[PDB]
């Protein structure tokens, strides 16, 4: 927006989530997101090293 | 150990948990009150003499 000010906007990187309709707790939603994301992340580096 | 069986088992259990957490309980039953209608009193036969 101006000199010597640089903004780095948070863009959505992963769109996988499941809202808990039972509304029991909030950790279930975060665990669902994390687990579904790690399922896909681990499948891309199966037998590979950077 | 075969690392590809653990991933499948984890995915299956996560899918089972996610499916179980979406079921909702909603009932829209009616009421036992009965709608009433109009009625008119009827006249029994009578005899009048003087």
TrEMBL record, chain A:
Domain of life from the UniProt record: Viruses
Protein name: VP3
């Amino acid at each position: 927006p101006e000199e010597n000010v640089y903004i780095l906007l948070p863009i959505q990187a992963y769109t996988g989530g499941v809202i808990d309709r039972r509304d029991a707790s909030f950790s279930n939603f975060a665990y669902s997101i994390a687990s579904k994301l790690m399922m896909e992340l681990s499948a891309a580096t199966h037998n590979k090293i950077f | 150990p075969n690392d590809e069986a653990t991933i499948k088992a984890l995915d299956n259990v996560i899918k089972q948990i996610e499916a179980l957490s979406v079921i909702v309980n909603r009932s829209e039953k009616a009421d036992d009150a009965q709608i009433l209608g109009p009625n008119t009193y009827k006249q029994l036969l009578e005899h009048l003499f003087s």
